Structure formats: C-alpha cells, structure tokens
C-alpha cells in the first residue's frame, strides 16, 4: 500500500500495511479479533476494480492502532486469500450499508 484517504481520514503507507498484516495473521490462524467476526469474507457486489483477484477478506483500519475488537469504525482494508493487498474502502460517503473507495481504490 500507499498513503490513503478514507473520507477525510488520512492513513500512512505503514498504517495500511499494519492493518493488512494483522488481517493476514488472523485469517491464516482461523481466528477473529476479539468478539468480532473480523476478518471475514468480503463480497465485491459493488464492482470495485481491485488490482488483485479474490476471494477477499475485509478487516477494519483505524487511526489509533491495529484493530483488536470493539467498534470497527467506517474504514476497512481488503486483502485476498494470499494476503495480497486489494485496497481500502469506507462507509464514509456511501449510502446505506455500501462502501465507496478510499483514495486509490476505484
């Protein structure tokens, strides 16, 4: 990854990488962060043009640190089953329960 803006929230390349790595670690361990269902399957029903092939996993990304449970916020990182980074999406600026891309994900 690169630095990305989700809504108006800015994340550095390192922050994206950290979230992605955590996502991978949980997925490969067949575990979830706390009582949450993250990471879990991500269905691209909206048609994001990800640079990598699926299937996908989504996991929250937040400014304050790697997600460990609790409220996930509006932002997510998307990785494939090989832990290849697919992109960053957010509920910010989307209607209903949909997502829009963070900068760089279209």
Swiss-Prot record:
Keyword Hydrolase tagged: yes
EC annotation from Swiss-Prot or TrEMBL: 4.6.1.24
Disulfide feature: 6-102, 24-83
Record-level Gene Ontology MF annotations: lyase activity; ribonuclease T1 activity; RNA binding; RNA endonuclease activity
Enzyme class of the recorded protein, top EC level: lyase
Reactions this protein catalyses: [RNA] containing guanosine + H2O = an [RNA fragment]-3'-guanosine-3'-phosphate + a 5'-hydroxy-ribonucleotide-3'-[RNA fragment]
Catalytic residues, chain numbering: 40, 58 (proton acceptor), 91 (proton donor)
Similarity-based family: Belongs to the ribonuclease N1/T1 family.
Protein's name in the database: Guanyl-specific ribonuclease F1
Species classification: Eukaryota, Fungi, Dikarya, Ascomycota, Pezizomycotina
Span of the entire protein shown here: 27 to 131 of 131
């Amino acid at each position: 990854q690169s630095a990305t803006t989700c809504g108006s929230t800015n994340y550095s390349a390192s922050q994206v990488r950290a979230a992605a790595n955590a996502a991978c670690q949980y997925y490969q361990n067949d575990d979830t962060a706390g009582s949450s269902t993250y990471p879990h399957t991500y269905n691209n029903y909206e048609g994001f043009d990800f640079p990598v092939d699926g299937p996908y996993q989504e996991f929250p990304i937040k400014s304050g640190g790697v997600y460990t449970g609790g409220s996930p916020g509006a932002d997510r990182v998307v990785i494939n089953t090989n832990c290849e980074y697919a992109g960053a999406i957010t509920h910010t600026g989307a209607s209903g329960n949909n997502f829009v891309g963070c900068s760089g994900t279209n």
